[PDB]
């Protein structure tokens, strides 16, 4: 991936980190069946006001080395291609070719 994309991702992450407490609270408020209608409405509107990049469902998992969006693995934080390389080199602990 590009540098720019990576930067964007980072920014998104930062935003998420920032706005988590508020956003979560808002969500809770919206959910809460034992609450006022007007309040709920306000909460809904409030959420809209907050930045979009603040959402965690905005950020894509990219490879930590290359930034490749596809072929990702969570345990390693790496795209398949890089993961394989790591494995070959001995750089991922415990990981070896499996047969059964």
């Amino acid at each position: 991936a590009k540098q720019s994309m990576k930067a964007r991702e980072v920014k998104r992450v930062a935003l998420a980190d920032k706005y988590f407490a508020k956003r979560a609270e808002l969500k809770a408020i919206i959910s809460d069946v034992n609450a006022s209608d007007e309040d709920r409405w306000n909460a809904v509107l409030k959420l809209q006001t907050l930045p979009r990049d603040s959402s965690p469902s905005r950020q894509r998992n990219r490879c930590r080395q290359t930034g490749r969006p596809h072929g990702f693995l969570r345990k390693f934080g790496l795209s398949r291609i890089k993961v394989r390389e790591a494995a070959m080199r001995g750089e991922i602990p415990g990981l070896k070719k499996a047969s059964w």
Binding site: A87, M88, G90, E91, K96, K97
Partner: peptide, 13 residues
């Protein structure tokens, strides 16, 4: 290296 990590070669990390 990769094929032998379980047997004769060790890991780095």
């Amino acid at each position: 290296n990769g094929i032998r990590l379980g047997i004769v070669k060790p890991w780095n990390s």
